[PDB]
């Protein structure tokens, strides 16, 4: 069982923007979408 202790480390203090944290990794590769109409 993992338990994370939080003591010092603020990600937002005085800045008007929704801050992006250091974990950004989504699965992307194939995106299917064939148009059947003009050029087949």
Ligand X SMILES: OC[C@H]1O[C@@H](Oc2cc(/C=C/c3ccc(O)cc3)c3c(c2)O[C@H](c2ccc(O)cc2)[C@H]3c2cc(O)cc(O)c2)[C@H](O)[C@@H](O)[C@@H]1O
- Binding residues for Cu(2+) are 6, 10, 13-14
CA distance 25 to 40: 35
Residue closer to ligand X, measured from CB, 19 or 40: 19
User: Is 35 near ligand X (CB under 6 A)?
Assistant: no
User: Is 24 near ligand X (CB under 6 A)?
Assistant: no
- DSSP letter at 16 equals S
CA distance 39 to 2: 56
Residue closer to ligand X, measured from CB, 33 or 38: 33
CB-hemisphere CA count at 13 Å for 23? 1
Report the interface residues with ligand X, using CB under 6 A.
Answer: 8-15, 19, 28
């Amino acid at each position: 069982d993992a338990e994370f202790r939080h003591d010092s480390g603020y990600e937002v203090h005085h800045q008007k923007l929704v801050f992006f944290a250091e974990d950004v990794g989504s699965n992307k590769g194939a995106i299917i979408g064939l148009m059947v109409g003009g050029v087949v």
